[PDB]
Amino acid sequence: QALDARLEVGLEQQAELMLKMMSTLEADSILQALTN
Amino acid sequence: TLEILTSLVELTRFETLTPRFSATVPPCWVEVQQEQQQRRHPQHLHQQHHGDAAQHTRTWKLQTDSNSWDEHVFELVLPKACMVGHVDFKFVLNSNITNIPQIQVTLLKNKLCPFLEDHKEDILCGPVWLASGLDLSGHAGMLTLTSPKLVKGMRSFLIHVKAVLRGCDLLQEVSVTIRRFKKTSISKERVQRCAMLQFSEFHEKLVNTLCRKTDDGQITEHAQSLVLDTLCWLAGVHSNLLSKTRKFLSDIVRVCFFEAGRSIAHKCARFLALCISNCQPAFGPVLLKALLDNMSFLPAATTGGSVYWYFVLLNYVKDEDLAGCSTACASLLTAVSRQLQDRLTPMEALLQTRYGLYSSPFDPVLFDLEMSFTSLTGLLEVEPLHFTCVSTSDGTRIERDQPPPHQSIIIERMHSGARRFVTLDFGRPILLTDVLIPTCGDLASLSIDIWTLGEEVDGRRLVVATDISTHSLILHDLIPPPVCRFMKITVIGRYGSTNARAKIPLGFYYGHTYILPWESELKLMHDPLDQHLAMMVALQEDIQCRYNLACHRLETLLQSIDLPPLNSANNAQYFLRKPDKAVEEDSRVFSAYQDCIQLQLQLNLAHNAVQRLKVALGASRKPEDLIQTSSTEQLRTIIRYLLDTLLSLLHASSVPAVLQSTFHAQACEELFKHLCISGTPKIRLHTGLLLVQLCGGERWWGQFLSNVLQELYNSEQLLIFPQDRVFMLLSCIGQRSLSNSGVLESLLNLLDNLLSPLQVLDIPMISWVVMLVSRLLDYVNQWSFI
Amino acid sequence: LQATPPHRRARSAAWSYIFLPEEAWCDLTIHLPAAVLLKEIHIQPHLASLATCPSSVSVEVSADGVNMLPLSTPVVTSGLTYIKIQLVKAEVASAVCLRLHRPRDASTLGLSQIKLLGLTAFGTTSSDQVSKTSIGWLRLLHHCLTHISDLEGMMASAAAPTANLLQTCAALLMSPYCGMHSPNIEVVLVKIGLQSTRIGLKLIDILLRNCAASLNSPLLFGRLNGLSSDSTIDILYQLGTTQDPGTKDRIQALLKWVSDSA
Amino acid sequence: LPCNMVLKKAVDSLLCSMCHVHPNYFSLLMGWMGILALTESHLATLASSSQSPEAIKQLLDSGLPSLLVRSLASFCFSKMPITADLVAPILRFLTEVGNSHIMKDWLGGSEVNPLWTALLFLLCLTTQQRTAIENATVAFFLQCISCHPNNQKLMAQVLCELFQISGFIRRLFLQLMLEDEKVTMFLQSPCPLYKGRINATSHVIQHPMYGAGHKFRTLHLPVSTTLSDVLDRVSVFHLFHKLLAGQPLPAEMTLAQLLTLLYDRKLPQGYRSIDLTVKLLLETCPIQSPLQVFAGMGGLALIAERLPIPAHSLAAFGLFLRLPGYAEVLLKERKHAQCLLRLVLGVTDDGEGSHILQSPSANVLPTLPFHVLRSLFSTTPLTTDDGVLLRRMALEIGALHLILVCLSALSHHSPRVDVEQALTKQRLEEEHVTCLLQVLASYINPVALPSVLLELLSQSCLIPAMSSYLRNDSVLDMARHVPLYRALLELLRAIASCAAMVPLLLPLTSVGTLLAKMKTCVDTYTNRLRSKRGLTLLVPDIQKTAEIVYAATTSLRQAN
């Protein structure tokens, strides 16, 4: 979601995308767990 | 040494090929002008330094031919012989994609799949799975075609894309760009990179210095950061090196997440992220063991931002050995919860009950700050960045409607799809590290540019947000932080909108006001354009003095504050109509309490700023005794992450088979008593909800609720706690466990026993029990008036 | 029903009813989502054309919202710019049926707004004490005990013997203000307790040990034993520091309760 | 019971009462605790139960207070083993027992005053331990010196020794001396006092001697609190004290005056509380505050050497405080002086959560230091040695140079070698110029000077400013700035009265000629008014100053 375009220059754009996906998936699980 | 490490990093840098390569593709691939592709996001300003795609980038749309589903070959002749760093193979898939295609992408040289078997000797980049490059959107992604062979070379190439809509026919769009290694003064720079790629001893020694197992452990924090930069390049270029990292993983995790700052963890997180993305043993179990092995040291972690990444990685890798994460977290949570209850002070309990304020204003040490796993984290390591409005577009301006005051741009005429801009002068080059802009529905998109001298001199585009109407802008821990001074925000109004006046929250920006000599170094970036420590310590001492004075004020005001127990009708009226003097006392307490919290944040920031400067200088930042010596704020943060981890464990659920030897009647009671009574609202809520999801289905559960009710609300209980908030939790807990027949049975037995004197009555206890029982039963119209 | 009334000069009635030639009454049933303590019903006629104001209004109220019951005979409403029907006794009402009589001189009935004012049982909307409580008797007893000091003794002697008087005065002491300020209840308890040692001991037991009564018998189960307020503290201090033959015994009782507690 | 529990406090109050009835029981109590291993609970219980004359006397005679003080001093400089964790409990224990005036004298005695220096050295340990010890130490010293002149003197001496200003010491000074003293007031009445009470349950566990019920009240009020406020907190009602038998106390006495009377009436110094009776001399000086005692030892001069409200005003105050006797003139306005002292220490709050700038009479703060300095200078004549001493130190520190810089910045002149916002800024600057000119005149001619004085005033902006202001031909214009012109005329008269400064008036467009022209203008205006038939106090000022300046210039010219 709306990454900074400067990450494309190096080899860390995929790494940063994967970290945010980690963070977002964890946030969704907590919200889903709390809303049973 | 610092020079050799700096030399290695400069060797690992990249540049884009200034002159465009030629490409020959099957007829079904049709090129598109780069201006057309970048119409939404023009690169014409970047064209000056050949950054625009028209000078170096080729693009092809796919035509659904007869064999479009089959092999595709992009033959790529470079403009000149060069030290090629990698080839970026970008692809965008059709949004309506039922399945991810099985397409292998490989790079060859001009004079396994049948074509590749024939061209086996010409392979430069091994077969790359198409799915590996996917983006989060589901229909997007990119492959960074690279390999040791590609680095070990210097005229034409072949990109072979074969599908094992079908296969490549689902591949709507592809694009390729080439990036070379930066031109470095180092002699035989090509030979130096070849050396790093081949020799294993280089990799092993890198791990040792990162772990501070070399040079008497005097490796500076900046030195560790550089080592991670080299490691990131190695993993990206390669895809045995994994063995060195895996064998020393425990120490790597320890030093980077419990002894370093947020940036090191983020860089280490990036390095570990790349490693996961790569016939070797599964990496998940190995990473999990290291994280779990260091978990017991969480109470001794240095910064909250460091722990954040630690728990993020663990959350991804928890899927293996579910019991270990659960048992480790449960053991640590039970261990940490006991101390948390033991550290509650009577003054803290009074604030929680009378006012609902759950911070520890008398505990100066924080661990984490967030702004908003959905918020900026580790914000104690960075400073709030103040700015002054210097120039504006049209009649717009800013108004205020240490941390910067909340500011928003008021625009007198918004129109529809109309661009406006504001230029922010920080008054100095500031190392910008974090930015947060609240979601603004008045505009369709938001662009951020940054420049030190001038927009057209050294102007940089920080970000462009197209979903800023439905999401806030959050830039978290920029790894190559810009060194800008001036901030231009250009906002494009919403389409189909004519709101006369617009109020766009400017947001918040963080970083540092003292760029280190290496931080400001313009040679360490891609495509460029000690006294402070003494002063900071002087300021920190002032904040300590004032914060202690503010803390003393809170105690003096609270020492005259009294909390009537909720056990009599007169007490009930006290809560129903707060007398004016009682109202004023709360107003003074709230004002005084805010002062303590503000100064607590500043003290931690001042401590964090001073520690950064002492960390620039060669220095290092620092089982059950650790919990004993941990700060209160650190324990609360650890429990939150642990509670969230356990909650995700239950949601993601054999994990219920384990956690039954623990979380028994006493442990459930112990956990509830320690955390739900005294904990923060989020900890309270999560502990209650966690207890329901785990033990709600046990036979003793109803007895636990009644025993909790008996112990906490009987009139012989002197414990001060938020009965109303805890009671709301209990009502919520019973509702979510009301399917267990024992809940209402035991609750009515308590009511039965409490009323036995009629057939001494404890009327307040009866009131609590009846209301709980009443709310639970009505969940199980004439009574709608109640 | 809209909370915001139309403009006072709204030239057209917000609602109008055309009467058939044989129809005398039109009815408007307001059902509420839940029962409320209805206290007033306001009806706003169309002020521009008062000829369409109903000649009379018959209010029926249903606590259960099903069985309507007329509150009273229809109220004559012709010639009124505003119809304010106040219920003398607030009634639980989940439905209100207004029966409006055809105007004297018009075939159409025009109304602007209907308000149902009242309270809920609980929540934010849940906003003669002597007549609804027993406090009047305690005020009478206090007047007898205190109005003429020279008679105090006799009065107390006449009041002390009655069973459960001290328990009742203690119960009224610890209740929320109900038409008698706590200090007067304290005066009653102290003056009764000081007229002889036996009731001083009983009062000490009530304030410290057991305040319960000693289907018609008084119970006073509602209050926790030994609860303290400024009132109980003042009563205990005056009992302890009052100089009389029983003083010693009272102190003894106090110390006994201390030892027992320990 | 666990410590600090209110129930434990009540049981300990019962124990205190029993000890007061049977003092020998107290001895037995101390026997039961081992008076060695004293837990914090033992200390709490002993401190609570020891609050009786007999009990406190026996506690002192047991040697436990001395043993604790000696062990604490031994710990600080590193007969009982004392650890840092027990320091704060022990400091609180000493504080509670020091509530009594006898233990207050003992804690301030010769044997214990070394412990004060020991603690101060120790603090000037884990962070939590250090914070706890700091809080306990501040409370301990505040209790020790609370309405105790001897302990106030002792602590001021210790702090002066310490300085011969940041971190713990600044906080301690702010809390101890830069906060108003609070005394506990014990009110008795023959009738219940209901005002100030809430029907809800409140557990106020005080010392049993403070009584119970509606006829007794105990307040913790600043010593500045007026007796009328005390009465209004409980309710015609008259406050009485047993010492002043049969003499109604005025309701505006304030607790400082009452303390002065009681100490004059032999109330033991450091007595825990003022016991008044609610039944139904104003010139007396208030008791010296800790700040007043500290300043009386010359501490305020020492502070200055270690140092919206203008920053320049604060700098001027900091500079002026180094002068001998400036502090004495400063303390005539106790509250404003306290506010300024808090301001210079990097503290914006007035100690009650209110920002100083938003505090009452904050508009006098910016110019108060210069008014105080003018009062100081005016009372020190040249003939007395003190006048020369004061002037010489004022020049040495840089007071005159700063004054001239402020004059150049405010009058917009330079060294010789929206609309309403600007108008009010100009008016404030005009007031600053008036006060500065008066300050210079007093410094010159108080109500002798360095010979180099003329060089400074000539190289300054003073001559340009006076020349520009004297070139006013409209008497009505002079009527609109009466204070400024009065100050200018006073400065011109003072200069013309000093033959070594007269040369500043004669040509260097001289100032004296301009004064003569203004005199002619005013005389002509008065003649015009006569023909037609705050200038009243200004129309003689111009004449007198013109006459004197002209006489001085003529005398100088004859001297030449």
mmCIF file of C-alpha atoms in Angstrom, chain B residues 361-468:
data_model
loop_
_atom_site.group_PDB
_atom_site.id
_atom_site.type_symbol
_atom_site.label_atom_id
_atom_site.label_comp_id
_atom_site.label_asym_id
_atom_site.label_seq_id
_atom_site.Cartn_x
_atom_site.Cartn_y
_atom_site.Cartn_z
ATOM 1 C CA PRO B 361 3.015 9.156 34.905
ATOM 2 C CA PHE B 362 5.393 8.453 37.799
ATOM 3 C CA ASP B 363 7.390 5.877 35.808
ATOM 4 C CA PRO B 364 9.698 7.962 33.579
ATOM 5 C CA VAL B 365 10.776 5.078 31.334
ATOM 6 C CA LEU B 366 8.661 4.367 28.258
ATOM 7 C CA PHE B 367 9.278 1.564 25.801
ATOM 8 C CA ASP B 368 7.162 2.338 22.743
ATOM 9 C CA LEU B 369 5.197 5.172 21.164
ATOM 10 C CA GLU B 370 2.652 4.914 18.362
ATOM 11 C CA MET B 371 0.604 7.444 16.411
ATOM 12 C CA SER B 372 -1.692 5.617 13.978
ATOM 13 C CA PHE B 373 0.415 -3.344 13.581
ATOM 14 C CA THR B 374 -1.471 -0.425 11.997
ATOM 15 C CA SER B 375 0.527 2.510 13.373
ATOM 16 C CA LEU B 376 3.976 4.031 13.313
ATOM 17 C CA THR B 377 6.093 2.292 15.954
ATOM 18 C CA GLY B 378 9.331 2.992 17.776
ATOM 19 C CA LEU B 379 8.765 6.744 17.644
ATOM 20 C CA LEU B 380 10.789 7.392 20.791
ATOM 21 C CA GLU B 381 13.984 7.087 18.723
ATOM 22 C CA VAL B 382 12.961 10.003 16.470
ATOM 23 C CA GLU B 383 12.120 13.617 17.108
ATOM 24 C CA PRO B 384 8.935 15.506 16.215
ATOM 25 C CA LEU B 385 9.739 17.783 13.277
ATOM 26 C CA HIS B 386 8.461 21.355 13.527
ATOM 27 C CA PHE B 387 7.966 23.422 10.390
ATOM 28 C CA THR B 388 6.917 26.935 9.386
ATOM 29 C CA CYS B 389 4.741 27.919 6.437
ATOM 30 C CA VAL B 390 6.860 29.977 4.026
ATOM 31 C CA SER B 391 4.999 29.780 0.695
ATOM 32 C CA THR B 392 1.514 28.683 -0.327
ATOM 33 C CA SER B 393 -0.518 28.314 -3.505
ATOM 34 C CA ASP B 394 -3.384 30.797 -3.940
ATOM 35 C CA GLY B 395 -4.927 32.115 -0.697
ATOM 36 C CA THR B 396 -4.379 28.915 1.280
ATOM 37 C CA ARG B 397 -2.710 28.989 4.687
ATOM 38 C CA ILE B 398 -2.126 26.898 7.807
ATOM 39 C CA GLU B 399 -3.656 27.176 11.269
ATOM 40 C CA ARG B 400 -3.068 25.340 14.543
ATOM 41 C CA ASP B 401 -6.355 23.444 14.410
ATOM 42 C CA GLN B 402 8.398 18.528 21.669
ATOM 43 C CA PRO B 403 5.528 17.545 19.362
ATOM 44 C CA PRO B 404 4.306 19.861 16.601
ATOM 45 C CA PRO B 405 0.811 21.300 17.023
ATOM 46 C CA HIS B 406 -1.793 19.665 14.838
ATOM 47 C CA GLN B 407 -1.909 21.714 11.649
ATOM 48 C CA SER B 408 -4.152 21.519 8.601
ATOM 49 C CA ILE B 409 -4.174 23.433 5.329
ATOM 50 C CA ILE B 410 -7.277 25.571 4.938
ATOM 51 C CA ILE B 411 -7.982 26.130 1.244
ATOM 52 C CA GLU B 412 -10.467 28.828 0.323
ATOM 53 C CA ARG B 413 -11.375 27.351 -3.082
ATOM 54 C CA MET B 414 -11.045 23.594 -3.635
ATOM 55 C CA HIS B 415 -12.908 23.106 -6.943
ATOM 56 C CA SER B 416 -12.709 19.545 -8.325
ATOM 57 C CA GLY B 417 -9.520 17.755 -9.306
ATOM 58 C CA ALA B 418 -7.643 20.986 -8.592
ATOM 59 C CA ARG B 419 -4.005 20.918 -7.500
ATOM 60 C CA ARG B 420 -2.765 23.057 -4.624
ATOM 61 C CA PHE B 421 0.616 22.985 -2.927
ATOM 62 C CA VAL B 422 2.209 24.044 0.347
ATOM 63 C CA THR B 423 5.939 24.439 0.975
ATOM 64 C CA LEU B 424 7.258 23.678 4.460
ATOM 65 C CA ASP B 425 10.597 25.011 5.715
ATOM 66 C CA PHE B 426 12.025 23.033 8.619
ATOM 67 C CA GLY B 427 14.649 25.754 9.050
ATOM 68 C CA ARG B 428 17.507 23.292 8.480
ATOM 69 C CA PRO B 429 18.407 20.044 6.685
ATOM 70 C CA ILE B 430 16.603 17.446 8.793
ATOM 71 C CA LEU B 431 17.108 13.699 8.579
ATOM 72 C CA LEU B 432 13.507 12.804 7.754
ATOM 73 C CA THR B 433 12.660 9.314 9.004
ATOM 74 C CA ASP B 434 8.899 9.053 9.568
ATOM 75 C CA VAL B 435 5.824 10.827 8.204
ATOM 76 C CA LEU B 436 2.122 10.453 8.970
ATOM 77 C CA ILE B 437 -0.686 12.294 7.172
ATOM 78 C CA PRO B 438 -4.287 11.628 8.298
ATOM 79 C CA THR B 439 -6.622 10.366 5.605
ATOM 80 C CA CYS B 440 -8.164 13.300 3.720
ATOM 81 C CA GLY B 441 -11.373 12.671 1.793
ATOM 82 C CA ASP B 442 -11.351 16.165 0.278
ATOM 83 C CA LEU B 443 -8.528 15.257 -2.134
ATOM 84 C CA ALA B 444 -8.033 12.407 -4.603
ATOM 85 C CA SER B 445 -4.230 12.138 -4.459
ATOM 86 C CA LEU B 446 -1.295 13.626 -2.562
ATOM 87 C CA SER B 447 2.281 14.102 -3.758
ATOM 88 C CA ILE B 448 5.239 14.821 -1.475
ATOM 89 C CA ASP B 449 8.457 16.346 -2.783
ATOM 90 C CA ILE B 450 11.518 17.287 -0.741
ATOM 91 C CA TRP B 451 14.515 19.504 -1.517
ATOM 92 C CA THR B 452 17.330 21.117 0.441
ATOM 93 C CA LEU B 453 18.394 24.024 -1.806
ATOM 94 C CA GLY B 454 15.581 24.193 -4.365
ATOM 95 C CA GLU B 455 12.956 22.081 -6.070
ATOM 96 C CA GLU B 456 14.683 22.306 -9.456
ATOM 97 C CA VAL B 457 18.198 22.093 -7.963
ATOM 98 C CA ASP B 458 18.014 19.027 -5.709
ATOM 99 C CA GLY B 459 14.274 18.307 -5.669
ATOM 100 C CA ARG B 460 13.248 14.807 -4.613
ATOM 101 C CA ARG B 461 9.848 13.104 -4.759
ATOM 102 C CA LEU B 462 9.320 11.470 -1.376
ATOM 103 C CA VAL B 463 5.995 9.782 -2.161
ATOM 104 C CA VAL B 464 2.746 10.019 -4.126
ATOM 105 C CA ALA B 465 -0.400 8.665 -2.472
ATOM 106 C CA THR B 466 -3.419 7.889 -4.649
ATOM 107 C CA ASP B 467 -5.537 6.270 -1.895
ATOM 108 C CA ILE B 468 -5.000 9.127 0.574
#
